[PDB]
Amino acid sequence: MITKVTARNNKITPVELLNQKFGNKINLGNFADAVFTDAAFKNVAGIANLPMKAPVMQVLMENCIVSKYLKQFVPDRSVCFVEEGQKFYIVLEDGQKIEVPEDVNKALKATVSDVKHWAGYLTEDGEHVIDLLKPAPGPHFYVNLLIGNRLGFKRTLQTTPKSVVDRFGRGSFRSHAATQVLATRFDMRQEENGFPANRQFYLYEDGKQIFYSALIDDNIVEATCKHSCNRTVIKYKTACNLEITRTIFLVPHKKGFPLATELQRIEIKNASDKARNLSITYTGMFGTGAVHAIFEDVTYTNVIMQSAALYNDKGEFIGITPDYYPEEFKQDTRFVTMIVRNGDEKSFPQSFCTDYNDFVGTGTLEHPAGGCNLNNKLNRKGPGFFALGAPFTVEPGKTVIIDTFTGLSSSKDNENYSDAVMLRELDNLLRYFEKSESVEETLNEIINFHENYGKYFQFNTGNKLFDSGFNRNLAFQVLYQTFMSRSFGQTQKGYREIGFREIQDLFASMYYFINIGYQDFVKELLFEWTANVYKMGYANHNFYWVGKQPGLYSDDSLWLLQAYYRYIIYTKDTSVLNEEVPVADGNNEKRAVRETLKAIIQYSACISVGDHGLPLLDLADWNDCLKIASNSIDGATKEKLYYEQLKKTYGDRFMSDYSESVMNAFLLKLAIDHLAEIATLDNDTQLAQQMSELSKEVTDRIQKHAWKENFFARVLINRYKDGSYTYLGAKGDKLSADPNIDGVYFLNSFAWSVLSDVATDEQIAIMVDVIKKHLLTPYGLRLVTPADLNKITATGHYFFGDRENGAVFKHASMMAVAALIKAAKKVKDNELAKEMARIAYFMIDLVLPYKNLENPFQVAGNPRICTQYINTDTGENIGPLLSGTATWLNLNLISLAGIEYTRDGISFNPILREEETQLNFTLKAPKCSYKFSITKPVGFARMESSEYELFVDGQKIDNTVIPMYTDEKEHIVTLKFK
Amino acid sequence: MITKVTARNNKITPVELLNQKFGNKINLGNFADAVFTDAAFKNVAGIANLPMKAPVMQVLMENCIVSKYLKQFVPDRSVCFVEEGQKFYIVLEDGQKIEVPEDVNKALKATVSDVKHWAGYLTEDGEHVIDLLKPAPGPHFYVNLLIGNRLGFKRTLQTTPKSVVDRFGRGSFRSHAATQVLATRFDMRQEENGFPANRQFYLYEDGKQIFYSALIDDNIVEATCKHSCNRTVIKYKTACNLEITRTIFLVPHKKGFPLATELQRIEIKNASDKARNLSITYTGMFGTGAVHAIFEDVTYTNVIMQSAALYNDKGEFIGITPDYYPEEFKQDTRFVTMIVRNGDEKSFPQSFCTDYNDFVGTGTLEHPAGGCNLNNKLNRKGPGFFALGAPFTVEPGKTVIIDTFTGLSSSKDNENYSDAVMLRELDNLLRYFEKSESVEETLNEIINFHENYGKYFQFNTGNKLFDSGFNRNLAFQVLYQTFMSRSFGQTQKGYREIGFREIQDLFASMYYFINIGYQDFVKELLFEWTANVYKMGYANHNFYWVGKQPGLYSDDSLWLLQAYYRYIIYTKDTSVLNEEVPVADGNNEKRAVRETLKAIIQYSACISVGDHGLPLLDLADWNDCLKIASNSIDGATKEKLYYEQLKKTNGKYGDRFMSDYSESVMNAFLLKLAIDHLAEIATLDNDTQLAQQMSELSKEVTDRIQKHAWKENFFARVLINRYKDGSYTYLGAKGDKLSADPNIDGVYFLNSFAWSVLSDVATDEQIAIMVDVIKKHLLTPYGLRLVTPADLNKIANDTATGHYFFGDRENGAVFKHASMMAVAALIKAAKKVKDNELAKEMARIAYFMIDLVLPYKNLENPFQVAGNPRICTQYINTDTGENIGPLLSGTATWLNLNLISLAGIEYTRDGISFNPILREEETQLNFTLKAPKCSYKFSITKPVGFARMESSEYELFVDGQKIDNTVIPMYTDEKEHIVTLKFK
Ligand SMILES: [Cl-]
Ligand SMILES: [Cl-]
Ligand SMILES: [Cl-]
Ligand SMILES: [Cl-]
Ligand SMILES: [Cl-]
Ligand SMILES: [Cl-]
């Protein structure tokens, strides 16, 4: 009787209906916008010929003049606005073209003025300038990510502060782990990361509110946000002629500082001919220490704390701290302080509120009723809401500066901890920043540290958006992910530990740290990860202060050999192999890095193998949503069963019918090759020979049992005596959920068969054909083809296009691009190479953040930060902002530029775009420098198949391995393809 | 170097500083208010002579005129406003008394106008009338609780809908368990139970916003909320002369209805001389099915759903449902519909929005930029925000009615479930409510069901606030807690299962249900609880669809005998004992109720006992924050160890389970009572052998307690057996050596006293002694606290620290539930003890404690005491006197029992044992009492002073026959019986 129509099942869209109605009467262009005028969807109001997709109608319908005019026609008639000439006209299905009245025309003209830049634009330095009134392409588009700096201090990974900042400065701020300084919000909308008050302030004049930092009213004439590397600057101009600048950054750690401090500087310039007496109220919400109790017992979170006030030596109020009763929430101590700088004079706040209800009173957060006159009452309960007040006079043409310091001290950086330690550290912070210029100097330390950091690799091309995008923005993101893994962002808000696997981030950032003198830090990290390997060779799946989930996932330890291979090959520092690092098993057991690397290979090569001598899948490997195994087991559980098996009968096979992971075999084969080269370089001929032979034995196992006519299988299945299911991931697996596709195909089977150097040239060609047929979509390379794994009872969680139901997972797509690039350099068939390169560049174009500003309202994403996946139904780039995408994009762009590090130096083999005639970049090495220049005619060119000349400091060279020089001089490398 | 000053400090308060400065210069009256004018606390601005405590200064400082005036004096100098005549003056420390300017005087006069009623007031019917501008005494004060009605349908406990509504209609709404219909919010503030948009709407005129249901602006002239039993009515009058009425209630279940529906009716009357063309936009946020993912993965919650639109037979849009991909979130289906009634004609909404960002756009939720012209775009993603729009014209003097229906259908009430079932059920709902008067009729069904429900017991005294407070409000709360246990309220928002123990609620509500013909329902509940007892006699600690945590807590099964004793004694229905109910062990095993009650007693009396033959404490008993035991065990774990012990011993089932585990004295009292109960039941069932057996076992247990648990001062709480040392022997009396207060020898638990008397173990000499101890150490100016300070770290495995500041919860609060159990004991003793002076004193303490718990009294001094004037709260902070939530606790249940006990009603085998204990100042008490097959009118008169039947001269008559013993039979002649008691 009643009918249901879903958003996806709805037939025509508004724009398609507009075309059906007006397509043969006016030129609609190729972009238009429209909305249905009624709940039944029979008519549309639209606007024609836009320069790109944009929600123009929704911005128009905010205008009162325009909605009144349309009301004469809508909802009972369809309509389209057209600028046919330079006046606007309204057009009806009945042919009429009516000139709209002058005020409607003024408003339409103004609305459609700057549509090309509604999502903002990028400066030449890669910074995102955003208008605060314009709509958002999506919830991650207008977001920036900040990070502190604890390099050279205790426990860098675990103690580096981090925050998220949107275009109005909203969001939140953390110290160690998921410790909240400013309150995170866990609610319905992705846009709401923080409690709304966080970082916001009000200005008053004569008892009247005239400004709120997060409300654009008629008093605001200009309002812009600029997101840069590790700071955000938000600028306003009011009609009363004030110029307000908010600058937000995290303080780099110094001796004696709190573990975490966020600095917001507020500059207020009076651009008028008269002095003005104003007051500022600065607001925010401290995070609770009892995060779980937010869901389970909110009253608890409130009663366990009370507000407290801070006073200096002269009895002057300076700030607020939330005081906790339970000892478990007393190991961190939060604070907020404000300094008002009026020329010479510095002063502190004169009033405060610590109760949200008294502050808002009868009004709202945008217009609080108790916001000017603060009651100075310390709240006996939480939550830790604060409001700090101060009056001040700004003389004509002059500026007053308000510096706020918000932060946390912690036992994690201090022995014998109490709140006394916070008080000392806060004093150190405030003394260090007594001078006004002290803040500008630190901001410039930050800017310069990051500019310096990126100089490991600089592109210098005819495209400043790409250059700045890689040279600054991507460099920063790969730094960020080295410290933060996947643990914090706009929509990453829950507690996450560091994934053993996510040592991948170090694959890219390594070279950056080494080249600004932090080689010991990279060493530190290798060792921290190495301490999470058990004697038997498996790894803790996660660790933070301490490791957990021992050998839960089969792949983890294998990643470590790539990290070490990368470090040792680059620095030649073999001494790392003799280091005695704790084993994850505990006691006080230590083991030489060398013997650990041998144990990891032995676990996957000899012990935890299946019927075909390939590594066991266990619960799962890299692919987390591939859960099959009938009664998988831990590494600890396996260890105990392994030793009983040995009694009932070290290094022999653990017997079982468990499935085998082909991906792991590829990781293993690569790991072994890596160890061989390492041994050779370490002058250990026996280990090098042993591993070299083991590499051949594993290659033959894969080639014989995993190549399935079409593709490398993903999983080998051994538990059906039946022979009913034998493998998954190639033709004849009998597991497809698409009738048009025989078999299931995983992108990583291809990617790792090439990255491990197992696939022959004929097999690569074959797999590339399959990929073009079935994994390549108009939005890139999807992870897997549709599968029916129920045959070995879980249903899907996602509509088509999202995540595991057919998305382009950009991290996996970049691992596949790495394989394509590697193959394009080596395969004999130049035509195959050309095509693999085309695919690589096609996929890179879909991932480069800056390109999200071409068609931002369809593609969304974030123009400075890589996002996780592309919805294959809409093309939208979907968060989170932290993923393996940035790491592998970085590696890939450097690979395309031709840089690969080997034992004898740099193997130089660039693959440029067909249309490029020139590529230039600079490269730092620890004890030298390089300038590279590559020229070629239009068309596909590579060293394996084109004529070329290579010069190093003007001397023609036949050897394409360029040595790592140590003379501290800049070396000119020139490559001319004929 | 830097100094820290917490909110808890010994510094002078603002009011005390005001007194120090102005006390000898102006009359400050009895009450004043003040605030510090600066962050250093050196000066105050205040106002003198208020009729009660109130945040008058804070309300004044909202006024722009007044804060400007004060700025001439503050912050550098102190000040006090004083009214002299009809003019206001400002007074300085330097004596000057300055007349304030006329606009400041206008504003001060208006502010201080109605200060006595700033927290609202109660109608004679016990309804709370609240002004929407005035401040809140606390986060639970302005809150109402609503409930559906699934009586006579499947699984009543688990399927009854419930919602919470504050004075602006904010909050949320649930179906089964913690299934959200409208979205709950889990954030920093206790005031924020729901997503802000829930239940709110906007009115437009000529494309201009003129009204928002949750914003009081200059256009609003009056704005009032009325909270009644199971509905809330919110009224507004605008300056443009509209009268808006919002009525909110939950729909009682009917055949074919959705499992949960909330109805909000919006009436808009044009009180002007011209027609007006308006439109309404009705908003809200559907709850997600993926609650955990709100913390763990918010993007997930968004992508797993999309919006969908609903259309009737004529292709007319009627509403929105959120459509889910994953099967796990497709077993419930939510909807929202709106009907606009303009006289005879009904119409449906003409537009919608399902995207919060498009709706708010450039503005805010209070003033949305996209709120008038809705884009009609179905959102491909969540969250399930909705906005429904409709234009309408209201003629002069006429009213239009907008009915909204929000709800959920579920597989939990339907086999072979799909969203098609929702569509059918929604159609049944909309057909049933086609006629305008259909809504008023259902509201009246609700009003009348509750008025009828309360007629089990009606007080008719010279105090309407007390009468309505007990007769309607408390009746309702005890109903609510029978269905909801402790699972939902303003600040109870997480998932909670039903505690075996919380069958206590049925102790009070039982009689109410029976007396409106729902005796089977009470029977159903007894049986549902009985199915969670295992063969061996222990119980699942929690159950919802299914039971869990088998014999985790030692007390649970013991409560069941009180429920049955209460049912059987009242109805005489012994047939319940032959009923075959499933055992919690599963298979298809059933057992007779009779043998289960025997198994419970055997478990605690014979099997799970310690060295002194008293029941084991195990992990814990009633007191959850009493965790000690070195390596406690489950009942299932115990069972398995018990059967191997019997093998390695040649034992007989029923022998003792051997261990050094501690014993619970509270459980011994529960046991002793349980056994007495079983004896009386057997006697009534004509089972003379069981009755004799239990009577003897009651004596044997009484001697064990009396010999091993009485410790010169008090009954111990716990007996400790694991120290060969003899280093610690007991906890809960003098010489236990476990006090954390140097001034107190020993630790004293309120429940040791309470249950020693409720079980009838304590002698008269022991009661006198314990009452002395209680007056010394447990009685505070804010009532009876649960326990005295203890140092349990000496005997626990842990090294636990406290979580609470002094006064809150386990650090010294008055837990009102425990205080009401102690008052029950005081009342029982006051009736029986030989010493009349002791009785008099116990009765004073009882009434003193009841006065601190009666909700209506929270409106005397509301801004210190807070609470809620219609609903009992959980505890009183012993530092401030504030009544703190949640709104659901054992307090209401035991308050109900206690007030009925004081009125003199106790049910026994021979009928009603009538022994009233009136207040000293009362000269008269009247009430009516329903019984299943008769009725009673009671009248009691006495002179001023303490009076009781054990020690005063009196006459007692029944219709006109003198009674000499206290017993009034339960008549069955369907007539009203007049009972008169005259104390001389
Ligand atoms: Cl994969
Ligand atoms: Cl994110
Ligand atoms: Cl990822
Ligand atoms: Cl207790
Ligand atoms: Cl509550
Ligand atoms: Cl309780």
Residue numbers in the entry:
A (entry chain B): 1 to 649, 653 to 795, 799 to 984
B (entry chain A): 1 to 984
Question: Anything the authors wrote about it?
Answer:
The crystal structure of CDP from Ruminiclostridium thermocellum reported herein is the first solved for cellodextrin phosphorylase enzymes. In contrast to the typical glycosyl hydrolase mechanism, only a single carboxylate side-chain (Asp624) is required, which acts as the general acid.
The structure of the CDP was solved to 2.3 Å resolution, revealing two copies of the protein subunit per asymmetric unit forming a clear dimer. Both the α/β domain and the N-terminal arm interact with the β-sandwich domain of the opposing subunit. Firstly, the catalytic loops differ in length, being twelve residues longer in CDP. Whilst the loops are structurally similar up to and including the portion containing Asp624, they adopt completely different conformations after Ile628.
